[PDB]
Amino acid sequence: MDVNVNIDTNAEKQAISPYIYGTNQDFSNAKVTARRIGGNRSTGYNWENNDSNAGTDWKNESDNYWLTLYDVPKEKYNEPASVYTAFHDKSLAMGVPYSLVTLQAGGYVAADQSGPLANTDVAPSSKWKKVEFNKNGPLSLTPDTTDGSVYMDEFVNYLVNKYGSASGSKGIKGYSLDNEPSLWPSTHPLIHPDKTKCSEVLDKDTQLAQVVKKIDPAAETFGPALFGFSAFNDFNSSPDWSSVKGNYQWFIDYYLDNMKKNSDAAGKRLLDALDLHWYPEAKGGGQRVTTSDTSNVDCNKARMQAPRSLWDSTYTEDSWIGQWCKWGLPLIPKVKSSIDKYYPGTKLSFSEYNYGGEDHISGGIAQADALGVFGKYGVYFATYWECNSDKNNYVQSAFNLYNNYDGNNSKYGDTDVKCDTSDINNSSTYASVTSNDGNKMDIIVMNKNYTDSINFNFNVSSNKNYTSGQVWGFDSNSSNITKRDDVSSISGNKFTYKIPALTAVHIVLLEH
Ligand SMILES: [Ca+2]
Ligand SMILES: [Cl-]
């Protein structure tokens, strides 16, 4: 089929945030620009001794899981925050410019490593230390592990003491206000048996964000870290939602408006990034696309289309969101409208997401598309979450397609520009320019079609004169990014490139 692509390097310009190419889990061979330590294990992580609790993901088990996961040596097992310092040390060693780390708000953190806890061990008990936000006495780099409490200000202070402020080269840049708070009772029944109130989340986010700003005025806060659309909507059927709803379309408006009001009252921004998790509910072939089963072709197809629910008002996905909450899709324009109406200047983060089929071309194309979307639509931060025991070779290809396509860490541009394809069903196209190198334009082009090749007819409107194009890509035959044939000929900033089915490509155009 033929598809036209119209690029204008002087229209619809948008700064691409460098921190969209992040992860929660390290890749064996993929370039990242941001890393998070967060998720379910964060809520009951004790910084004083590194103990944590799995909650209902793993038998309410209190253990050394985070010590092993983050490769803390045995002689640092009892060093405060050794899990977080191993983590941020690795960020620095890798040259990764942004670490997002999680602080605790659930209410209690593991006191020991006694294994699976009984329902009788519900907090408060000898199994739990109480979280407090403020110590109200002098801070120590050697916190007391023998009392019944753990202090968040003392924790951040330890980290800043080691690394300095976020304003400097080594500082941790971001702090997450715990994790998935409306799921505290079902993920962490032993910490937080009761449903989380809208007023409770607001208050805890507000007070925890004030601790961060006190200790590191330059550090950024991420909240509320909502699990999914149900929490965006009515904070997962929060018992107090009816009484605080008023005119608010959804909990996101309530949350933004009140953080704005709370920030104005405190005299400083307390929320830097509205932080959200997005595991697509989109289905194909009767399956949610997050599945690892790639034998299901209609599921594979839905997977590559699913990123369209983030931005495209013409796309309808097969899900309960698509059926019952059409008002909330496409997601990013909706959230962006809420930000512009309730808390202007707030950034948007996706600290967990995963499109499934990680070891399949449909999983790589969907991941490549999600990364394009984040960059085109003003996402500040995003961190992929691993769902398939590191069987993620095509996910890694997508990351490398952007920032290490040639194995020499050549990267995508920092400025998104107008790049309109005539077929959004069968293709995705992103173009970028690099603010300090006018010699080049970078284009991501994917053929989402399962069987047919696409002749892409490119029309670049620019004052630059591009004369050569190089091409790198992956496809259904290999996750390995191979250098493909050069662009044939460029005449008057126009050229053609034929892409086979299920292929994702990075095109580099040069004036010279
Ligand atoms: Ca203590
Ligand atoms: Cl949540």
Side-chain angles (χ1 to χ4, degrees):
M1 74 195 78
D2 290 6
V3 168
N4 303 315
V5 181
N6 297 327
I7 301 159
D8 185 345
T9 64
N10 199 228
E12 311 171 31
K13 291 189 218 216
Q14 174 80 203
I16 306 181
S17 167
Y19 318 116
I20 69 167
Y21 309 101
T23 194
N24 284 275
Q25 287 82 26
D26 288 321
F27 298 123
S28 53
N29 192 22
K31 187 65 197 275
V32 299
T33 64
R35 293 163 80 250
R36 167 174 189 260
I37 182 180
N40 291 349
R41 276 282 186 163
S42 70
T43 300
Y45 171 79
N46 183 333
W47 79 279
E48 303 184 347
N49 61 13
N50 303 284
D51 298 346
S52 64
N53 192 284
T56 58
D57 296 345
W58 205 253
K59 292 114 175 148
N60 284 322
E61 184 180 280
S62 279
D63 62 23
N64 67 357
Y65 175 78
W66 260 14
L67 290 164
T68 68
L69 187 63
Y70 291 97
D71 299 309
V72 180
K74 90 193 159 201
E75 79 278 350
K76 290 154 176 196
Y77 284 172
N78 303 124
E79 177 189 288
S82 74
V83 166
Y84 285 46
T85 67
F87 177 80
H88 188 56
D89 281 358
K90 201 178 166 193
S91 281
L92 292 167
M94 292 175 235
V96 168
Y98 203 112
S99 289
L100 176 56
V101 311
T102 304
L103 307 174
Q104 293 61 50
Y108 298 86
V109 297
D112 58 43
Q113 294 176 15
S114 55
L117 272 11
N119 292 330
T120 307
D121 292 327
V122 55
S125 78
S126 66
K127 262 77 206 321
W128 300 103
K129 300 294 178 180
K130 250 296 214 116
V131 177
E132 306 287 340
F133 298 146
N134 294 284
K135 200 185 175 175
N136 308 298
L139 272 21
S140 177
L141 301 169
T142 56
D144 185 5
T145 55
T146 66
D147 65 8
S149 289
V150 157
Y151 300 87
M152 295 301 108
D153 56 353
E154 188 165 62
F155 183 11
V156 181
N157 185 77
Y158 178 92
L159 294 167
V160 169
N161 171 276
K162 187 162 210 302
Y163 297 121
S165 175
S167 58
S169 49
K170 300 187 185 74
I172 292 165
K173 280 183 179 78
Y175 291 89
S176 182
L177 281 7
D178 207 293
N179 180 72
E180 303 182 357
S182 80
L183 293 190
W184 283 337
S186 54
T187 299
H188 297 291
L190 260 37
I191 299 187
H192 192 289
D194 299 341
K195 282 191 153 178
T196 315
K197 286 178 170 69
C198 298
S199 70
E200 168 185 9
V201 75
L202 171 61
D203 169 59
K204 273 170 169 184
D205 278 18
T206 293
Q207 297 185 0
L208 192 46
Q210 293 230 246
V211 163
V212 170
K213 299 305 175 161
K214 169 204 258 275
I215 311 298
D216 186 358
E220 282 173 348
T221 51
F222 286 63
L226 305 167
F227 87 86
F229 195 98
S230 165
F232 305 173
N233 179 195
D234 59 0
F235 201 48
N236 197 29
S237 326
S238 189
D240 69 327
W241 175 243
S242 275
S243 65
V244 308
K245 179 184 162 73
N247 298 137
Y248 295 126
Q249 175 67 80
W250 60 346
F251 167 87
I252 282 172
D253 293 344
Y254 168 83
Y255 180 77
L256 290 166
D257 196 25
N258 279 280
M259 290 301 299
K260 207 268 175 180
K261 166 178 175 278
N262 291 174
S263 300
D264 292 345
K268 74 189 81 160
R269 175 173 290 274
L270 295 174
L271 181 74
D272 296 284
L274 180 70
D275 185 54
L276 268 24
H277 300 169
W278 189 245
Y279 294 95
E281 290 275 23
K283 298 169 68 178
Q287 296 293 324
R288 194 179 172 182
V289 302
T290 49
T291 179
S292 79
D293 172 32
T294 61
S295 64
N296 188 334
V297 168
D298 283 3
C299 192
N300 300 345
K301 283 170 176 169
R303 175 173 301 112
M304 301 180 280
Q305 302 308 330
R308 283 167 71 195
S309 296
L310 296 169
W311 70 267
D312 178 13
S313 76
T314 70
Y315 179 72
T316 305
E317 78 177 25
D318 184 2
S319 68
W320 66 265
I321 321 179
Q323 194 183 343
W324 301 119
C325 312
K326 280 172 203 306
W327 54 264
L329 294 181
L331 189 63
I332 296 170
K334 256 38 66 163
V335 170
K336 224 83 210 200
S337 149
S338 303
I339 292 176
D340 294 358
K341 298 283 179 208
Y342 298 98
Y343 200 172
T346 307
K347 301 152 178 200
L348 178 53
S349 165
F350 293 96
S351 63
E352 291 177 34
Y353 69 90
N354 179 286
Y355 278 81
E358 295 172 11
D359 62 359
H360 183 81
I361 184 53
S362 67
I365 280 174
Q367 183 61 27
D369 194 34
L371 295 169
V373 173
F374 299 154
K376 175 172 180 189
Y377 298 100
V379 174
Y380 182 80
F381 186 97
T383 40
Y384 166 87
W385 186 277
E386 180 51 39
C387 300
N388 204 22
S389 304
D390 301 318
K391 292 179 276 176
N392 54 17
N393 56 312
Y394 276 92
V395 163
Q396 298 194 41
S397 316
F399 277 88
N400 289 329
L401 188 68
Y402 282 84
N403 299 302
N404 186 23
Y405 53 93
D406 64 3
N408 292 137
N409 294 121
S410 305
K411 51 197 222 298
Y412 199 63
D414 58 6
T415 319
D416 174 74
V417 304
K418 175 172 162 175
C419 192
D420 298 326
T421 188
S422 64
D423 196 344
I424 65 191
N425 192 226
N426 288 295
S427 80
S428 286
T429 60
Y430 304 98
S432 65
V433 151
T434 303
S435 63
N436 55 29
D437 182 18
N439 192 57
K440 89 165 158 167
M441 169 177 40
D442 286 278
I443 309 163
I444 305 293
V445 183
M446 300 150 248
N447 175 4
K448 308 177 274 178
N449 199 280
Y450 225 87
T451 64
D452 301 342
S453 64
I454 302 175
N455 299 304
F456 285 98
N457 312 310
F458 293 89
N459 314 278
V460 183
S461 176
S462 184
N463 282 353
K464 312 287 177 156
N465 177 249
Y466 300 103
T467 56
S468 63
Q470 291 183 110
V471 182
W472 292 260
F474 60 91
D475 56 27
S476 67
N477 296 124
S478 177
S479 57
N480 295 147
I481 291 164
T482 60
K483 189 175 205 272
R484 331 217 137 203
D485 211 34
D486 291 3
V487 171
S488 221
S489 47
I490 315 197
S491 129
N493 282 347
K494 289 165 153 57
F495 64 94
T496 299
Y497 207 80
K498 183 176 195 177
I499 292 173
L502 306 170
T503 297
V505 126
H506 185 152
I507 302 176
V508 185
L509 308 179
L510 261 22
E511 293 191 284
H512 300 114

